[PDB]
Amino acid sequence: MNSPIATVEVFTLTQPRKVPYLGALREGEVVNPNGYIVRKGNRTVYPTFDRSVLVRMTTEAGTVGWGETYGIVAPGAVAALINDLLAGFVIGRDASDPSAVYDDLYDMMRVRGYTGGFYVDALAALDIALWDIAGQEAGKSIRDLLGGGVDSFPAYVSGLPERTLKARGELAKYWQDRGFNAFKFATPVADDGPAAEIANLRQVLGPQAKIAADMHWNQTPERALELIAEMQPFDPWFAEAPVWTEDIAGLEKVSKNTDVPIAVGEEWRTHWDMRARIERCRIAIVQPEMGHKGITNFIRIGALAAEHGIDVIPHATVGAGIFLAASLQASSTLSMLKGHEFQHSIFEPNRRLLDGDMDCREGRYHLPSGPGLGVRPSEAALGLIERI
Amino acid sequence: HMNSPIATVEVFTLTQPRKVPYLGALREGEVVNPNGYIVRKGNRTVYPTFDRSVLVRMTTEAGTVGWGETYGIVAPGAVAALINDLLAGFVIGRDASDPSAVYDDLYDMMRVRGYTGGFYVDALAALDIALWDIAGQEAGKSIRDLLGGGVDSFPAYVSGLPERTLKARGELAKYWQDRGFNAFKFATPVADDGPAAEIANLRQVLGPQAKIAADMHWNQTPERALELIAEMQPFDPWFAEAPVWTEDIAGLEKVSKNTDVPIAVGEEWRTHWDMRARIERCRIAIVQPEMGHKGITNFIRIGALAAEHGIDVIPHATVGAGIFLAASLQASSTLSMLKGHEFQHSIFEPNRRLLDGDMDCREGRYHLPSGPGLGVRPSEAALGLIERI
Ligand SMILES: [Cl-]
Ligand SMILES: [Mg+2]
Ligand SMILES: [Mg+2]
């Protein structure tokens, strides 16, 4: 029995701990008075606090569900979308068919081109909350609601936050000894270049280790192909984000001129974004980010990967643990799942910010027990959240 | 003619009652939702029950004041938050010596996280327009001059037939024809009797020399869109706009390659990247950039790509105070592939009092403002009405 949504409340949660940047701060870099920093290398903006947007959604009968999306930059954007536009269209609906609610909300602004970006960030938080409600009302975990899922799967170390190439290798080794078999490094970081870095990691970790290279977008297809040729002898697991997201022609060119598996997708929003690429390019792996996408989008991307034999290896980012729990629930149902990003500093906050038995130990994620997401914000989180 | 650093960036909304009958479009017992939004059941799209846009006032340390504008009909707090919290801080201290450089820097801040369009570029658009306005004022040149020169007038086509019946819609089109307009567009969903009946009526009323385009409003499968176009084809449609869903590029390829009726798209795009994704697969005859979504930098890059491929440019127009419309006229006038420009008579006319500056449209042609920069600004009356956000 599904009770109608009564209220939708939006919050930000700013954390007392901070995930390090991949790439030490350098001479010339500036902290803007507005609290943001642009990296001189990649030109991308970064926050000086970790922060996410949480949504509390409550039924008339008193069932409480939580959703979460990105809030590191301009959280008032998602907050405005939800408070001014979206909440009003969710209140009165129920959780009998969360995906139908998502589709209705998406369709409202589709023709004006708000098919991704912040609009879908907002839909993501709403969609997760609604599934959390649906699971609780059914007395079922979300993964059971979606037809069943495994209770554990492999995690890989998605980043190595140490300042030197030698230190990054020691950190990788530390995790290897603790059950991890797969690792990834960011190509722009090493002073001596990505070939030098993968060579070192391969030497340190041995032949069996899976070692991927996250190329962080900023290359022409020709340059990307060069870098990949240099890394190739060291048996890279995959090359991620070889060129700019918008440069589909470049992505096509790279993917068809190397046999190294190409992985993309953390910055997508919907299966529509995937269709645009897999129609032209040779994509081995897609890497959806729950916090940007929501459960509905996540499973549609999964289903499409299964139609084409594409591997699914979800991205992770720091948050309170709500969208991560959602990611685990949804990932567990996917036939094409081959792993899931993990970083200690990304995962650790959920220990204090969540109640629930979601865990990551010995190189594997373990799903929480219980209906819905299987988790909820802890008393600590409830004290830190601020309305927006 | 030096460039003074930006000192302040101020965001406002301007909200006003709609002055055109628009609820006549709701026939299935549609209900007003919180904050004044209403969803049309036939197309599932949300609409405001008022007119509203986001205005930006940008001022240099030396006191030059520029204005930009973007969409604000829906959740203007989104763009406002983006500007107030994030973007303003990276514009302040910069100057207008190279507005496109500032645009590229702002766009780059968030592009790898997938904020490559939507409300993010909405926000960049308002900032870009304001910066170009300042650039021109500081150089003592109109924007079009600063961009290498542009025409001072060009054809406008009529859109908006807010009459209940097919006949009255024809009569309305006739009136605008009598005023010197010779190009028109109608929305295919509007006709109870079908797009074929509508174009048939218009063609007869207006005669064979008139340009009559059909806006198909996205909601067809590619096969249904081809059928519809086939039904309209015998009446010489000027172009078929938005035959299928924006996301459905395969369907657009299919439609565009199975009809000789010119295909037009683009109002809901944000950058040349969106264009590239389409023209690389599809047969696009016309692109229809919307300045309020895009900004001048994005608009001229789209026009430049169009020139590379022999694609006509016929820009979109929409609800707004006239600030981004004026920016649209400035940028458009520099484009070799320009063939004309949408004209929303029902918005443009009553909004004259909201602007200072000589932007006009008459005798079927837009007439561009004469002054430096944008050439228009909010009137004293408009300044009385804007609210900070
Ligand atoms: Cl957006
Ligand atoms: Mg990555
Ligand atoms: Mg249109």
Side-chain angles (χ1 to χ4, degrees):
Chain A
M1 181 142 314
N2 305 113
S3 168
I5 304 319
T7 60
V8 172
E9 303 168 81
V10 191
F11 298 94
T12 57
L13 199 178
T14 298
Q15 310 202 0
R17 289 282 302 280
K18 179 78 191 78
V19 176
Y21 304 136
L22 300 174
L25 288 179
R26 296 150 33 177
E27 179 189 359
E29 291 184 309
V30 167
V31 178
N32 193 283
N34 64 10
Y36 296 107
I37 308 172
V38 168
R39 307 308 309 267
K40 271 172 74 163
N42 60 29
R43 301 300 314 169
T44 291
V45 72
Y46 292 86
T48 45
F49 281 88
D50 293 325
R51 174 178 55 194
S52 63
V53 166
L54 284 159
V55 169
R56 179 164 62 199
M57 181 178 299
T58 309
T59 67
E60 297 181 5
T63 297
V64 176
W66 289 87
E68 192 187 12
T69 185
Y70 274 64
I72 43 182
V73 183
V78 158
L81 291 173
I82 295 175
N83 288 331
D84 174 70
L85 169 69
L86 302 165
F89 288 91
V90 172
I91 289 158
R93 301 288 297 271
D94 63 36
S96 63
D97 188 349
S99 289
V101 174
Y102 165 89
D103 286 337
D104 284 347
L105 300 180
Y106 178 86
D107 288 348
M108 287 196 310
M109 292 285 278
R110 170 172 203 199
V111 311
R112 298 188 181 93
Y114 305 91
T115 42
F118 290 104
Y119 191 71
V120 178
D121 277 352
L123 303 185
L126 298 168
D127 182 81
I128 289 156
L130 253 196
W131 280 103
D132 188 21
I133 291 173
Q136 287 175 76
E137 292 179 323
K140 292 180 164 183
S141 67
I142 283 164
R143 69 188 174 287
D144 274 348
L145 261 191
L146 297 171
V150 295
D151 299 317
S152 78
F153 50 72
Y156 77 99
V157 182
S158 61
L160 294 168
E162 304 279 0
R163 298 168 56 90
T164 67
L165 176 155
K166 184 275 188 151
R168 290 194 291 276
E170 294 286 341
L171 178 61
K173 180 56 183 163
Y174 178 87
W175 291 117
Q176 178 177 64
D177 289 343
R178 289 155 175 79
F180 284 90
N181 305 302
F183 309 83
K184 175 168 75 190
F185 72 96
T187 60
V189 168
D191 285 342
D192 298 311
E197 182 118 40
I198 189 164
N200 180 70
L201 295 172
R202 175 62 62 208
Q203 184 59 33
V204 169
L205 297 169
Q208 300 78 16
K210 300 190 281 182
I211 305 171
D214 189 338
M215 300 179 68
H216 281 265
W217 301 278
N218 190 23
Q219 279 92 207
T220 59
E222 295 75 26
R223 182 53 180 166
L225 280 169
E226 296 187 354
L227 292 168
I228 292 165
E230 289 180 31
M231 294 185 287
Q232 191 269 353
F234 307 100
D235 194 19
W237 175 19
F238 56 80
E240 169 177 333
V243 302
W244 290 107
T245 313
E246 309 92 322
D247 182 12
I248 301 187
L251 182 59
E252 177 177 3
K253 180 176 188 181
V254 172
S255 63
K256 292 177 178 174
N257 287 277
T258 182
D259 292 315
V260 179
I262 304 303
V264 291
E266 77 188 54
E267 75 280 27
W268 292 347
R269 294 300 187 275
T270 73
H271 64 91
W272 288 117
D273 297 318
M274 183 176 175
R275 299 185 186 275
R277 281 107 186 136
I278 69 173
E279 283 174 5
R280 291 178 64 173
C281 312
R282 218 196 267 171
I283 308 306
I285 294 157
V286 292
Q287 303 173 302
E289 166 53 58
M290 180 52 74
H292 277 311
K293 299 179 180 59
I295 288 170
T296 295
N297 276 321
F298 205 91
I299 63 185
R300 287 175 179 171
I301 284 169
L304 186 56
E307 293 181 38
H308 292 93
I310 301 173
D311 288 330
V312 178
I313 305 179
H315 175 263
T317 193
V318 69
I322 291 303
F323 58 63
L324 174 54
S327 189
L328 303 194
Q329 295 285 348
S331 296
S332 72
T333 67
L334 302 183
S335 57
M336 303 305 296
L337 185 73
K338 292 305 170 60
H340 193 301
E341 281 194 358
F342 159 91
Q343 268 196 63
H344 180 84
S345 61
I346 281 178
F347 187 84
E348 189 72 4
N350 75 63
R351 301 285 192 193
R352 288 182 171 162
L353 298 179
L354 281 193
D355 288 340
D357 43 10
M358 172 172 66
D359 193 21
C360 186
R361 62 183 179 271
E362 278 57 66
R364 301 178 69 75
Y365 277 111
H366 293 260
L367 274 78
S369 63
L373 288 166
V375 305
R376 69 210 58 83
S378 73
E379 284 291 309
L382 291 177
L384 291 170
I385 59 182
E386 296 191 10
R387 293 191 186 278
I388 183 171
Chain B
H1 299 322
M2 54 80 184
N3 300 108
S4 175
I6 302 320
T8 58
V9 172
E10 294 170 88
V11 192
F12 301 91
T13 51
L14 170 58
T15 312
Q16 280 212 304
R18 308 223 50 200
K19 297 172 193 176
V20 72
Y22 67 102
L23 300 169
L26 306 163
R27 318 283 202 79
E28 309 192 6
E30 291 88 341
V31 187
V32 178
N33 280 67
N35 303 314
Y37 296 113
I38 190 157
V39 165
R40 183 152 319 161
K41 293 189 189 179
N43 67 10
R44 299 176 65 121
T45 291
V46 69
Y47 298 86
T49 49
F50 45 82
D51 284 347
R52 182 171 59 196
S53 64
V54 164
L55 287 156
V56 170
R57 177 170 64 203
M58 188 180 283
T59 308
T60 72
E61 292 174 10
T64 300
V65 175
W67 286 92
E69 189 190 15
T70 184
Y71 274 59
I73 45 170
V74 181
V79 159
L82 290 168
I83 293 171
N84 289 322
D85 180 69
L86 167 68
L87 299 165
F90 292 97
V91 170
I92 290 159
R94 298 292 294 267
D95 67 35
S97 58
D98 190 348
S100 290
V102 179
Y103 169 89
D104 288 340
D105 288 341
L106 300 181
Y107 176 86
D108 289 348
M109 294 200 297
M110 292 288 274
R111 75 193 278 203
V112 305
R113 298 192 182 97
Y115 303 100
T116 53
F119 290 105
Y120 193 68
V121 180
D122 272 359
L124 303 187
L127 299 170
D128 190 74
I129 293 171
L131 250 187
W132 278 103
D133 186 14
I134 292 174
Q137 285 181 60
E138 291 184 318
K141 292 175 183 175
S142 62
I143 287 174
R144 61 190 183 288
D145 264 339
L146 194 57
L147 292 169
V151 299
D152 299 318
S153 64
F154 51 69
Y157 77 86
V158 185
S159 187
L161 296 177
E163 280 292 348
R164 235 159 23 198
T165 64
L166 186 150
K167 176 192 169 270
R169 285 198 297 282
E171 299 289 2
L172 196 52
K174 179 60 115 51
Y175 172 79
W176 288 100
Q177 184 182 52
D178 285 338
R179 287 161 61 78
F181 291 76
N182 30 66
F184 313 79
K185 180 170 77 178
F186 75 95
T188 59
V190 170
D192 337 72
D193 254 5
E198 189 83 17
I199 196 174
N201 187 64
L202 295 169
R203 175 54 69 201
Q204 187 209 106
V205 160
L206 301 172
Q209 319 312 353
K211 291 192 177 72
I212 313 171
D215 190 332
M216 297 179 63
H217 280 261
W218 299 279
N219 191 15
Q220 284 86 17
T221 64
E223 299 77 20
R224 179 50 175 166
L226 286 170
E227 292 183 5
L228 289 181
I229 291 170
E231 292 182 19
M232 293 188 298
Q233 185 279 343
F235 302 94
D236 190 26
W238 178 17
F239 54 82
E241 160 174 351
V244 298
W245 291 109
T246 315
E247 309 94 325
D248 183 11
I249 304 181
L252 183 64
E253 175 173 8
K254 181 182 181 175
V255 170
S256 70
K257 280 173 176 177
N258 287 290
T259 187
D260 292 329
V261 179
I263 308 304
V265 291
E267 72 190 62
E268 76 274 31
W269 293 346
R270 297 295 188 275
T271 74
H272 66 91
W273 293 109
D274 301 316
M275 187 166 168
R276 296 184 188 275
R278 274 96 189 155
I279 71 186
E280 290 176 353
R281 299 179 53 176
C282 316
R283 202 154 62 138
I284 309 304
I286 299 156
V287 291
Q288 308 171 295
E290 166 50 59
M291 176 60 65
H293 280 313
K294 299 180 174 71
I296 287 164
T297 300
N298 274 321
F299 206 93
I300 64 181
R301 285 171 186 177
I302 280 166
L305 187 57
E308 287 186 13
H309 293 96
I311 299 179
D312 292 342
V313 180
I314 307 178
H316 176 260
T318 185
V319 165
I323 299 297
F324 62 65
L325 175 56
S328 195
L329 303 191
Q330 297 281 359
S332 295
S333 72
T334 71
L335 305 180
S336 63
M337 300 307 296
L338 184 75
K339 291 299 185 299
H341 197 296
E342 189 165 15
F343 172 63
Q344 300 279 13
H345 57 104
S346 303
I347 307 300
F348 186 96
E349 293 299 327
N351 287 4
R352 292 178 182 272
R353 59 184 286 273
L354 300 176
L355 299 171
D356 292 332
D358 63 322
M359 170 173 59
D360 200 14
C361 182
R362 61 186 194 265
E363 186 77 297
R365 302 171 68 72
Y366 273 111
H367 291 259
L368 275 63
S370 301
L374 199 63
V376 304
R377 63 179 191 184
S379 64
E380 201 65 33
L383 292 180
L385 297 175
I386 57 180
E387 304 176 80
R388 295 198 182 272
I389 183 170

